[PDB]
Amino acid sequence: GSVTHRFSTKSWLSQVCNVCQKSMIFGVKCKHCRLKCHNKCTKEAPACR
Ligand SMILES: [Zn+2]
Numbered sequence: 494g495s496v497t498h499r500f501s502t503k504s505w506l507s508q509v510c511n512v513c514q515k516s517m518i519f520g521v522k523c524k525h526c527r528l529k530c531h532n533k534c535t536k537e538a539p540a541c542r
């Protein structure tokens with residue numbers, strides 16, 4: 494079928510990117526593995542195991 498995980502958007506308030514970690518509120522939820530990362534930051538964040 495497809496091994497592509499679907500990401501979602503989230504922005505609480507006091508949350509920080511789990512990749513570059515900076516002043517902002519950007520987060521993405523990856524299923525199959527369950528991870529959090531900037532709106533994208535794919536260049537920094539690793540590959541969804
Ligand atoms: Zn980031």
Ligand SMILES: [Zn+2]
Pocket residue numbers: 498523524525526527528541542
């Ligand atoms: Zn995943």
